[PDB]
Every structure is written in C-alpha cells, then in structure tokens.
Amino acid sequence: SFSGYLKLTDNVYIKNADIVEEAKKVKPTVVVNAANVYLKHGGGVAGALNKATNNAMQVESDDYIATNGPLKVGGSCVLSGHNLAKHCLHVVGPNVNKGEDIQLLKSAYENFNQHEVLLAPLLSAGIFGADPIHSLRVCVDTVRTNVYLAVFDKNLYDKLVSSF
Ligand SMILES: CO[C@]1(C(=O)O)CCN(C(=O)c2ncnc3[nH]ccc23)C1
C-alpha cells in the first residue's frame, strides 16, 4: 500500500517522491501519466514513465493513436501500466507553454473520478507551464476518488504543503 503520505483532505494525499520509483515499489492499480494529445512521451513525467517501461509504453501508445487519432485536451485514455501498474491513465492537461486554455485543467482532473484510487502527478505542472499551487487547488476541488500525489521537486513539495 501507499506509505509516507501527508493527508491534505478526506481523499487527497501528497508525498515528495519520484513517481517512477513510487510506481515500481507500490505497483498501484492505476498510475496517471501527464500526456499530450499525441501520446508522444518524450520528456517530463511522460518521458520518465516511458523510459522505465523500456519504451513499451510508447509502442503501445503509437498503436493506439494509429487506430483512434489524438486525444482531446482535457481527455484521457486507459492503456497498460506495463511494469509500473496494472493500468496507466493517460491524461491531457492544458499546456500553457503551447498557449492552451487553463480552464481545461478541471476537465482533465475529472477523468480521475472514473478510478477508485490513483497514483498521480500534478497535471499541467512542470514543463506544461501552469502554477502547481493552482493545479493542486483544482485537484482537491475536482477529484472525489482517492488520489496519491507524487511531487518530484523537494522545494516545490514544501511550498505546496505550507501554502495549502
Ligand atoms: C509538480 O511539479 C513537478 C514536480 O515536481 O512533480 C515538476 C516536474 N513534474 C513532473 O511531473 C516531472 N517533470 C519532469 N521529469 C520528471 N520525472 C518525474 C516526474 C517529472 C511536475
């Protein structure tokens, strides 16, 4: 089970951890990937998760896109979790650095409500350009299922907890 998490609300927990190492240790039912609409896992959390799967996540993702076309910003798909989890929920938050609408962040977090418990990063944070404090606020105000947030950056983790 999940261990070492601080409790923020009735259903949201948080830890300063590398989500790849956390997924390998816990092997959760669902790990969330911070995806783009093309499922091109080059960098950020997506690049790190994909590298941990030895590129099997990218091979599966390219077959999914060839069949179905791109996801919508705010949308998601369920694929295999490979060696990290039973399933991977690929969720597309808006990328502010690409000029996407931050209002779609709530729609992105609504995908989490389809799963009873998830290991997840903060959506639209990091290289997606949104304020992580805002992303945590939208997460707590949207997700009703049990979410275990992994924040890689120690200094950001301390700021998120102290300003919550
Ligand atoms: C909330 O801000 C971030 C964090 O500290 O968790 C900043 C970075 N973020 C990531 O998900 C991330 N970005 C690049 N490489 C990574 N390797 C593993 C995770 C990851 C989100």
Curated annotation (Swiss-Prot):
Changing T29A: In strain: Mu/B.1.621. Residues 1-164 form the Macro domain. It is a multi-pass membrane protein. It is found in: Host endoplasmic reticulum membrane. It catalyses: Thiol-dependent hydrolysis of ester, thioester, amide, peptide and isopeptide bonds formed by the C-terminal Gly of ubiquitin (a 76-residue protein attached to proteins as an intracellular targeting signal). Inhibited in vitro by GRL-0617. Responsible for the cleavages located at the N-terminus of the replicase polyprotein. Participates together with nsp4 in the assembly of virally-induced cytoplasmic double-membrane vesicles necessary for viral replication. Antagonizes innate immune induction of type I interferon by blocking the phosphorylation, dimerization and subsequent nuclear translocation of host IRF3. Also prevents host NF-kappa-B signaling. In addition, PL-PRO possesses a deubiquitinating/deISGylating activity and processes both 'Lys-48'- and 'Lys-63'-linked polyubiquitin chains from cellular substrates. May form homohexamers. Interacts with N protein. This is Papain-like protease nsp3. It comes from Severe acute respiratory syndrome coronavirus 2. The chain holds residues 1027 to 1190 of 7096 of the full protein.
